[PDB]
Design a protein around this ligand. Structure first.
Ligand SMILES: [Ca+2]
Ligand SMILES: [Ca+2]
Ligand SMILES: [Ca+2]
Ligand SMILES: [Ca+2]
Ligand SMILES: [Zn+2]
Length: 315
C-alpha cells in the first residue's frame, strides 16, 4: 500500500469502460491516493470475513468479469467522495478525510449491500434479483451516506429515526447519481432485476409504485424491517422529491426549488439539527429551520419545504 500512484483502466458491472486510481508496488492495488486518506477496495472472495484482501492486480487492467464489481465499488466511492467534497465541502464521511473502505464479492448470491459501521460491503446478487450491487451509483452513494449520517446526526436505525436515516441515504444517493449525470428518482434501477426493464427497488417520485407509503397516514407501524425503515422512508423520499421537482400530492401543491437547494437544505438539517432520536415532525422542523438559515423565513424555499411536508401529512 506504500507504492506509486497510477491510473488503471477497466470495465464496470454494466460493461462500461472506466479509469480508476490505483497504487503500484509489485502489484497494482485498488488504492486511490488522490482522495483524502485513501479509497481502498477489497476482495471478500465469496466469504463473509471482512474486509478481505486489498484488491491486487498484475497489469493494471480490470476487464475480467470478476473485476467488474471492484472497479465500480472503487470508482463510485470516488464519485461520492467528490460530491461531498465539491458540493458540501465535507471531507469524506467523517469530515476529516477518513479512508473509505469497500469489500466486493461478499458471500454468495448475496442480494444486498451495506455499511457495517466501518466500511462498505457489496454482494454480487444472485443474477436474477440483483447483479453486483456496486454497479449502481445510487446504491454506492446510499451506503456511503449511512457513514455520513452515523458520524453526524447519528439517526438510530429504528422506527421513524431509522426511516429518516434511510431517506437521507436515498436522497443523497439520488443526488450523487444526478451529480455523476441516466439520472432519475428511482433507487437501484441499474442493478435490480436484469430481465425486467423499467423497475427499481424504491421510487422517490412515486413510492406507492412498489407499495411504499407516500403519506404519513399510510405509514407502517409493525415490527418488520426495524419498524419499517425502508418502508416509511417513502414518506420522506416523496417529500424530498416534491421539494426538488414540485407537484401536487393529495391536493397539496408544491413549488419545486431544484435538486441543488434540496441538497443544501437536507445536508444542513443532517449536520446541524438532526439528532439520533429525531422523528418525522422534528425532521420537518429541522428542514424548515435549515431553509430559513440559507434562504430566509419569507423565502420560496421555506414555503416549499412546508408545502412538501404538508403534502405527505407530516406536521
Ligand atoms: Ca488485470
Ligand atoms: Ca439512473
Ligand atoms: Ca437511481
Ligand atoms: Ca430491473
Ligand atoms: Zn440504507
Amino acid at each position: 500500500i506504500t507504492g506509486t500512484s497510477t491510473v488503471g483502466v477497466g470495465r464496470g458491472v454494466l460493461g462500461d469502460q472506466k479509469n480508476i486510481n490505483t497504487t503500484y508496488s509489485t502489484y497494482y492495488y485498488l488504492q486511490d491516493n488522490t482522495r483524502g486518506n485513501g479509497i481502498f477496495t477489497y476482495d471478500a472472495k465469496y466469504r463473509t470475513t471482512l474486509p478481505g484482501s486489498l484488491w491486487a492486480d498484475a497489469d493494471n487492467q480490470f476487464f475480467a468479469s470478476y473485476d467488474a464489481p471492484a472497479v465500480d465499488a472503487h470508482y463510485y466511492a470516488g464519485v461520492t467522495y467528490d460530491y461531498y467534497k465539491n458540493v458540501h465541502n465535507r471531507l469524506s464521511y467523517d469530515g476529516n478525510n477518513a479512508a473509505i473502505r469497500s469489500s466486493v464479492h461478499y458471500s454468495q448470491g448475496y442480494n444486498n449491500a451495506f455499511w457495517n459501521g466501518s466500511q462498505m460491503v457489496y454482494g454480487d446478487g444472485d443474477g436474477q434479483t440483483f447483479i453486483p450491487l456496486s454497479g449502481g451509483i445510487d446504491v454506492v452513494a446510499h451506503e456511503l451516506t449511512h457513514a455520513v449520517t452515523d458520524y453526524t446526526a447519528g439517526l438510530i436505525y429504528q422506527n421513524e429515526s431509522g426511516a429518516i436515516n434511510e431517506a437521507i441515504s436515498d436522497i443523497f444517493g439520488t443526488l450523487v447519481e444526478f451529480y455523476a449525470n441516466n439520472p432519475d428518482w428511482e433507487i437501484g434501477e441499474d442493478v435490480y432485476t436484469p430481465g425486467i426493464s423499467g423497475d427499481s427497488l424504491r421510487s422517490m417520485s412515486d413510492p406507492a409504485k412498489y407499495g411504499d407509503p407516500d403519506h404519513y397516514s399510510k405509514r407502517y407501524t409493525g415490527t418488520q424491517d426495524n419498524g419499517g425503515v425502508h418502508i416509511n422512508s417513502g414518506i420522506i423520499n416523496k417529500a424530498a422529491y416534491l421539494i426538488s421537482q414540485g407537484g401536487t400530492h393529495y391536493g397539496v401543491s408544491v413549488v419545486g426549488i431544484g435538486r441543488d437547494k434540496l441538497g443544501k437544505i437536507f445536508y444542513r438539517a443532517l449536520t446541524q439539527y438532526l439528532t439520533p432520536t429525531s422523528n418525522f415532525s422534528q425532521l420537518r422542523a429541522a428542514a424548515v429551520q435549515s431553509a430559513t438559515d440559507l434562504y430566509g423565513s419569507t423565502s420560496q424555499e421555506v414555503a416549499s419545504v412546508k408545502q412538501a411536508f404538508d403534502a405527505v401529512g407530516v406536521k
